[PDB]
Amino acid sequence: VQKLFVDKIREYRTKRQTSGGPVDAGPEYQQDLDRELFKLKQMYGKADMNTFPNFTFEDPKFEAVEKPQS
Amino acid sequence: DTSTWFITITSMIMTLFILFQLKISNYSYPASPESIELKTQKHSTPWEMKWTKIYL
C-alpha cells in the first residue's frame, strides 16, 4: 500500500504547482467567499487596514447653585 | 331739720373728690400681671426665629 501511498504524494505536488490559483473553483468559489466575508464584515465593523483611531471626550460641566444659609 | 338755705356743704364735697381720686388711683389689678407674661414669650420665640433665620 506504499506504492499506492506515493501515488497520492505525487498528486499533492502537482496541486502545489499553481499559477492561476483555483482551477476547479471558477466564479463559484470567487463569488461566494467575497460575498461571505462582506456579509460578515458588515456584522464585524467598518475599520480600515492601517488607520489608527484617536479621539477625545467631553466631561460634564460641574456647575453650582446657591443656597442662603447664615 | 327742714334745714334751709344751702350755701354750706356742697362746696365742701368737691374738695373731697380730689382726695378719693388720689387714693383709689394707686391700686393694682391682678389681671395686668398675667399680660406681661405673654409678650415675653413671643419676643424670645421671634428672637429664636431670628436665630433660626441666622441658621437658615
Side-chain angles (χ1 to χ4, degrees), chain A residues 1-23 25-27 44-45 47 53 60 64 68, chain B residues 1-28 30-31 33 46:
Chain A
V1 306
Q2 291 182 357
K3 50 215 61 172
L4 187 89
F5 164 73
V6 189
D7 189 289
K8 315 156 190 214
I9 314 300
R10 179 212 87 83
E11 307 200 3
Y12 308 144
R13 299 212 176 90
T14 75
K15 190 49 184 178
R16 284 177 75 109
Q17 310 312 119
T18 182
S19 278
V23 53
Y44 190 76
Chain B
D1 195 73
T2 80
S3 58
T4 45
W5 150 91
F6 295 172
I7 310 195
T8 171
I9 329 164
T10 79
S11 172
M12 288 74 83
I13 211 174
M14 203 57 209
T15 172
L16 202 72
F17 286 7
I18 313 153
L19 299 195
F20 271 95
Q21 292 165 72
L22 268 169
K23 308 194 151 199
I24 212 161
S25 45
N26 274 352
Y27 265 50
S28 65

